[PDB]
Assembly symmetry: C2
Homo-oligomer: 115 residues x 2
């Protein structure tokens, strides 16, 4: 149910020292990163994950420069940054997946009848 | 992770034509009731549920009058209202359970290189 400001593609040349792959959720609700999860995929593997429960990011060695700016996630910006080496060696189709996890709670009230 | 403005118990007398059992979530995030689920339990059974995704409420016949005001739910007010006849036969501990459903989405961007 999260909605995106979509972009078909972006382009870089040998002049780019670094690249940004845009990803913007337009209907974020999370007030804290604790229930946000972000996954970037490339050719069907996870090349970046942010686990908001842990406030930690995991990257594979072949995408060692991949990062998001966690300070922007609550605005719905999940944009992927990386160095040109990683960009050049991984041109093609990227998937940006964002999740806001379930939240629940309960409370107990006793209903009393007085006479 | 949902938090409540709690009340240990609420009293009613013969004068109450209807009864209100308070339930107030203090940290709601949902912007649409389609994402919210409410379950009121009494003695180990579900005596009222609202499935926000379906915009539908279910009650057992022994709580036929039981309801919430859906218009108040995004404020975190999941308070249960019933007739005195349904209340007087069912004194004791009520549990109010509120859930804000997970939300996910994905988008694809091609990173293209230009010579
Ligand atoms: C590469 O650099 C140009 C020059 O500013 C910029 O417009 C473009 O967005 C960059 N490409 C990417 C994919 O970051
Ligand atoms: C990326 O996806 C598009 C279709 O969405 C496809 O036409 C294109 O060939 C893909 N790019 C690569 C490098 O496979
Ligand atoms: C019963 O009525 C009184 C006064 O009208 C009110 O203060 C009280 O909250 C009511 N009790 C319930 C359980 O609704
Ligand atoms: C809430 O979300 C649903 C699903 O997108 C939509 O149909 C509905 O119009 C929205 N607004 C209200 C007031 O229910
Ligand atoms: C659920 O019912 C309410 C009636 O107050 C309506 O406003 C809302 O649009 C309905 N939810 C939908 C269509 O998702
Ligand atoms: C409701 O719960 C409390 C637990 O704090 C318990 O002391 C009490 O006996 C329960 N009331 C009824 C009517 O079973
Ligand atoms: Mg949520």
């Amino acid at each position: 149910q999260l909605l995106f400001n979509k972009t078909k593609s972006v382009e870089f040349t040998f002049g780019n020292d670094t690249v940004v792959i845009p990803c913007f959720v337009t209907n974020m609700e999370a007030q804290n990163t604790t229930e946000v999860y972000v996954k970037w995929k490339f050719k069907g593997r996870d090349i970046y994950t942010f686990d908001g429960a842990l406030n930690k990011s995991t990257v594979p060695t072949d995408f060692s420069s991949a990062k998001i700016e966690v300070s922007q996630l609550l605005k719905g910006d999940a944009s992927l940054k990386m160095d040109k080496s990683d960009a050049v060696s991984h041109t093609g189709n990227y998937t940006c997946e964002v999740t806001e996890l379930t939240r629940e709670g309960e409370t107990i009230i006793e209903l009393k009848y007085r006479v």
